């Protein structure tokens with residue numbers, strides 16, 4: 001419902017591509033799904049793509065994961 005979809009929360013499946021902003025990630029485990037990455041400032045930053053082995057989740061919206069621009073435009077309040 002609306003509460004479960006207010007933030008991204010995408011859970012990755014094996015074979016999907018994750019994105020991390022190397023400039024803004026607090027640590028290497030901070031990741032974004034493709035849509036949030038492409039809808040965020042980090043599309044313009046130094047980034048790393050990493051194919052998921054399944055599991056993990058998108059960190060769009062977590063101030064404690066990103067030094068700047070924690071929300072993509074879609075999820076930004």
Ligand SMILES: [Zn+2]
Nearest residue numbers: 008033036058
């Ligand atoms: Zn996302």
Ligand SMILES: [Zn+2]
Nearest residue numbers: 036060072075
């Ligand atoms: Zn997002």
Ligand SMILES: [Zn+2]
Nearest residue numbers: 021024042045
């Ligand atoms: Zn960034």
